């Protein structure tokens, strides 16, 4: 794996010698919880909603209320 052998434009990754093309089911399988994986996005969506409410009230009253 020297980075110069490319599957497609922008995709040149290769497994190192001894390593698998895919790690699912392998010793290196991360076994990520989908529930955990989604928590970031949930947090950001919640903040976006609270910010939007602040913005609407700000437009109405002229003073920011956090």
């Amino acid at each position: 794996y020297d980075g110069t052998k490319c599957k497609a434009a922008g995709d040149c990754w290769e497994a190192k010698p001894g390593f698998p093309d895919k790690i699912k089911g392998s010793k290196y399988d991360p076994k990520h919880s989908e529930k955990e994986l989604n928590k970031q996005d949930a947090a950001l969506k919640a903040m976006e909603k609270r910010n939007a409410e602040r913005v609407e009230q700000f437009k109405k009253t002229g003073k920011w209320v956090y």
Partner: protein, 596 residues
């Protein structure tokens, strides 16, 4: 912002962290020059009242200096006519738990300024470690708005300076060491409204691609790569946070910045090029859509977080054609110069030839040719890899003299051993997965823990160094250059220094109270040129001193590289201001005296 452009032309002002939208850190002020810089002495000083690392530097505009601190991120305003009075302060209330999810000290890289219009007066804009972005009335310090831009419960923090362009505030992201997917966000300064938000990984709908994305360089990659260069949903915790700096070209109306490292550090847990981490972006300002994106470090194996400074210039290339450029000294030890309209790769040179993870960057293919002997992988301890994860360059904001056509680079000379380990992702928890041991590189003095810095003067077209100087410790805080023929920078062992812009000769230095991890800045007030700098050591290099650590692999490998810092500096926090002969408003001893 048209007004920011005009303000940045005046030596009375330093209106943004990079001084101007091009990030030149270049001053046309010549009062302080090669022949008299030895006469520079402190004019006055100011303690911030907090410790830990003091990154960024003050702003000056409208005859007022604005000063930021590390957590809890207090802001001070000072009228330059009477520097001893605090015109106003802003002291945020934050959950102290925010400290616990900061990988690399509770630093903050500084304020931004929006000059006002007929709908809102001028604003000072700040970020908070706990994720907020806050707009303050510049004159009064009173809150104008406060928005949530990160949630510490999922490992998000903010350490980057906000960036103002036109009427937008742009804020980046931190927490790749906790598996945070990078996101960059713009808010309307008048209303606080979110205008756009784009991510570093995932579907194109998330990443924000212009219809012409990489049209001039399709071999960089175009559609679908934010998922197709990952296995399944690993991109959802895939890093790419942007916590460094931006540049902006008002004519092209594009801004530029780099996205950070993929998560985790354990490369074996994320097969694939991991786009679009480690990428140089050229984005349209109003929509945020990417016009080009060049991935510097496909499938990162080293934490070469691609967030470093962008410096814009216009120079004739090797074919004699005038090019609009960006120049970017990356963590990975390569200095990238791209055409800032097309994204074309112009040059890509090692900032020090000891860099060994890459043989060379092929300018035709755009790919770094990897040396497998210095890669990382599960089941192997990689040794004498250069650069260290800390980089041959980190967050320091450097400078470009447009007359000399030289970039003045504050460089780290650091290498490492590295060994990954398996670990689970849990939101709000660290997600690193490697043990690291960093130390001075081959040109330094590893046994004695020193020689880990360099300062180099660089031409982006020829790739040559005008001069190269060694430094006792990594030069972390950036550089500032002036038409006086001087290059200023601070050091971790507690000096501010000036070197000859043409030869690199050391002309002056002063022993500050504590080490420096921010950049010098300069401004002229009532005819006197001042140079000011933050002091207060911290950030990644000084975690050993700041958090009392001793294990050489502690502090993500930093502790073993910097044990000698504590023999030269302790913690601190303040601003030191310099002038010729220490000339000062308080030379009038009646200034501020009781009863006048």
């Amino acid at each position: 912002n048209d007004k920011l452009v005009e303000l940045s032309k005046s030596n009375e002002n330093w209106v943004m962290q990079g001084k101007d939208f091009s990030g030149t850190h270049y001053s046309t002020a010549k009062q302080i020059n090669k022949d008299n810089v030895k006469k520079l002495r402190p004019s006055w000083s100011f303690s911030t009242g907090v410790l830990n690392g003091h990154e960024g530097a003050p702003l000056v505009v409208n005859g007022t200096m604005y000063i930021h601190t590390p957590f809890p991120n207090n802001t001070f305003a000072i009228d330059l006519d009477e520097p001893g009075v605090i015109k106003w302060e802003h002291k945020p209330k934050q959950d102290p738990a925010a400290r616990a999810v900061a990988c690399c000290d509770v630093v903050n890289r500084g304020l931004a300024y929006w000059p006002g219009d007929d709908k809102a007066p001028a604003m000072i804009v700040k970020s908070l470690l706990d994720g907020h972005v806050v707009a303050l009335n510049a004159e009064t310090g009173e809150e104008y708005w406060k928005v949530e831009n990160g949630d510490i419960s999922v490992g998000q923090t903010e350490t980057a300076a906000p960036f103002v362009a036109k009427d937008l505030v742009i804020q980046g992201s931190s927490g790749a060491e906790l598996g945070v997917r990078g996101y960059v966000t713009a808010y309307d300064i008048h209303t606080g409204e979110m205008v756009w938000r784009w991510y570093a990984t995932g579907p194109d709908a998330d990443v924000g691609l212009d219809k012409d994305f990489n049209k001039h360089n399709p071999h960089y990659g175009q559609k679908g790569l934010g998922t197709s260069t990952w296995e399944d949903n690993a991109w959802k915790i895939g890093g790419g946070t942007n916590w460094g700096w931006y540049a902006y070209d008002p004519q092209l109306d594009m801004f530029y910045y780099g996205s950070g490292n993929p998560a985790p550090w354990n490369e074996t847990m994320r097969p694939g090029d991991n786009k679009w981490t480690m990428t140089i972006w050229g984005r349209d300002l109003e929509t945020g859509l990417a016009k080009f994106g060049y991935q510097k470090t496909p499938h990162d194996e080293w934490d070469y977080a691609g967030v470093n400074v962008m410096m814009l210039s216009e120079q004739k290339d090797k074919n004699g054609k005038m090019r609009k450029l960006l120049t970017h000294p990356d963590r990975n030890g390569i200095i990238y110069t791209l055409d800032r309209e097309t994204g074309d790769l112009v040059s890509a040179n090692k900032m020090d030839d000891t860099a060994n993870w890459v043989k060379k960057v092929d300018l035709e293919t755009g790919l770094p040719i990897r040396d497998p002997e210095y890669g990382t992988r599960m089941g192997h301890r990689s040794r004498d890899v250069c650069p260290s994860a800390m980089g041959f360059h980190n967050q320091g904001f450097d400078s470009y003299d447009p007359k000399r056509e030289l970039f003045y680079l504050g460089i780290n000379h650091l290498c490492m051993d590295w060994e990954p380990f398996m670990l689970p992702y849990r939101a709000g928890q660290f997600f690193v997965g490697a043990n690291v041991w960093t130390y001075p590189g081959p040109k330094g003095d590893r046994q004695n823990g020193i020689g880990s810095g360099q300062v180099k003067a660089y031409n982006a077209i020829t790739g040559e160094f005008a001069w190269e100087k060694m430094e006792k410790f990594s030069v972390w805080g950036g550089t500032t250059a002036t038409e006086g023929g001087l290059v200023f920078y601070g050091t971790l062992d507690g000096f501010i220094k000036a070197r000859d812009a043409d030869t690199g000769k050391l002309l002056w230095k002063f022993k500050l109270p504590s080490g420096v991890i921010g950049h010098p800045m300069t401004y002229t007030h009532k005819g006197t040129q001042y140079v000011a700098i933050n002091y207060g050591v911290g950030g990644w290099p000084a975690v050993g001193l700041v958090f009392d650590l001793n294990d050489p692999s502690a502090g993500l490998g930093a502790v073993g590289a910097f044990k000698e810092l504590a023999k030269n500096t302790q913690m601190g926090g303040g601003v030191m201001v310099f002038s010729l002969d220490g000339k000062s408003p308080y030379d009038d001893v009646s200034l501020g005296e009781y009863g006048m």
